Curated annotation (Swiss-Prot), chain C:
Changing residue 200 to R: Enhanced ability to activate the classical complement pathway. The chain holds residues 238 to 443 of 449 of the full protein. Changing residue 87 to A: Impaired ability to activate the classical complement pathway. Residues 3-102, 111-206 form the Ig-like domain. This is Immunoglobulin gamma-1 heavy chain. It comes from Homo sapiens.
Amino acid sequence: GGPSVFLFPPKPKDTLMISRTPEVTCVVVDVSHEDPEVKFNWYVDGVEVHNAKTKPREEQYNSTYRVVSVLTVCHQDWLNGKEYKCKVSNKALPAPIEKTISKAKGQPREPQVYTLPPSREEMTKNQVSLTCLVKGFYPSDIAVEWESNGQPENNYKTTPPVLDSDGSFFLYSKLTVDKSRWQQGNVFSCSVMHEALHNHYTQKSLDKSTGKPTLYNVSLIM
Amino acid sequence: GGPSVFLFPPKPKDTLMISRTPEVTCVVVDVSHEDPEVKFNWYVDGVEVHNAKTKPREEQYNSTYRVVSVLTVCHQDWLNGKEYKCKVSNKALPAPIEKTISKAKGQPREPQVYTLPPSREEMTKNQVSLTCLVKGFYPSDIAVEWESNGQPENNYKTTPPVLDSDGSFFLYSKLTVDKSRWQQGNVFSCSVMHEALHNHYTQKSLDKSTGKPTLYNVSLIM
Amino acid sequence: GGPSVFLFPPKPKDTLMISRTPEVTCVVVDVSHEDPEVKFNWYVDGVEVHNAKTKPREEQYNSTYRVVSVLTVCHQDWLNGKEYKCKVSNKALPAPIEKTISKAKGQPREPQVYTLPPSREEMTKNQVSLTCLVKGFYPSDIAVEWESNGQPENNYKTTPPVLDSDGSFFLYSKLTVDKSRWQQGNVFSCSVMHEALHNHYTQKSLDKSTGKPTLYNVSLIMS
């Protein structure tokens, strides 16, 4: 019944890395059936961008009109804290409504990354789960990716960040791998991308040899 | 009078790194004193852009003017091979000249990065040398940096890339480390940025006693 | 100045251990076709050399015309730092252009050469890369050649010298060999030749067992 705007901020996975271009999403819901057409305006620090693109109207199962607009923004523009305003004007609406967003503002904190060897009891099971702890970053946005031998791994899970007592955030990332690969000796790396990190990247490393001391001394039992 | 127009390609480090956008300039020199007006035009795939910047002329002892016009290029847009053309119109020049730049076409190859520990004999000298070797990257552009525990080090020196036996390229980077820091076991990271690299970044770790691990005991007591 | 003078300095490697006499060419390029004839004169310490030689002219695909000259120079003469001048005069050029070649007047610096054993990751690949670097030589004239039994391998690659903060120069040399031959413990060395080095020759031996002589494989059995 009542129109509302949920302006989607660009995903950090796109904004931080060069590979993908960040996109800004403006969604209009509860659009009046008499006036399907909706007029859009875009403000960047008080200027109008000519790169705006629009999508055709979509009708869902609930017969609620929803209009989505996607905007291409440079990677560095979002990181600079530029204010982005989406303005919606329609005949049904008595006055246009503007929703503004910007990146979170605060003191940056360099996250700390640790790797955890798998538990001994996990050796009983066929599959073993690794552990990468990233803790101590004030901003909520962060990227975590597992990769081995130079290729990405598509079987991993990252927990949402959880606020700490001091205000920092911590999270765990787990990678499930079969036991034979762990016995082989292949290296696994949990890479973290954050705005406060130097060069916006940090890589770690874990393998079977990390647990073993640098002096090869353990022999066969009995 | 033999005018010179130089279309400087953007620096590879700026293109690969996200901190600074790549910068493209189309400089014109050898301009007569009686003609201090220079007309600059920039076409992005045949479209005008309002980001063009104009700078005042600079006088030189060689009686040649120096005017520089610079444009910012999006990181993602450059990697797509988009055509960027600069057109210079001068009254002194009988014919205005236009030059277009685009990314070269080829098959990228993933480079291999290795770290070489310092020789024992060098340990008798005042300092030691850490060597980072990158090999097998077909494109001539590459970014090499060195860090230690987060803080970057600016003591590295990188040799210009040269051809290989199979047409590839290899690069060597040397950094000077005091023995006092090396004995404690400080961890150093060699960072490589390239187009044919996963997320255009790779870290190789090198520290004290990381090579030839000790193997002393092979038999257990019982 | 219509005609141009292209000077080819003697090869720094050639002036080293005697293989052939180094040749310096004072080529005259961009010669106008109207007056192909060119006047050539010498200036060496005020005395003209008696070993003057000339070569037939060559005509390129484009309109550029070149005149090439060759010489023979003793190895000890170049090391003496003598001054050389080839004077080119032509009707097209209003005034002659001066380009004098002489040895660099800098303080020699004794260079240091080291070898680095290949990394463990290189052992995974079918090829093994051996690297040796030379650093600390102020002059840019140096040679590095990977020498083995019989004919030296042609697979070696040398990077151009790079200036350092101290003002000296450093460079690397890389040789790729078969993985199987590495375990055989064959002798490997890269000879470095520089004017500052004693006898203009230095060698460093690289071997798998020379990296670490620590005793290993200690086994204890208790009843």
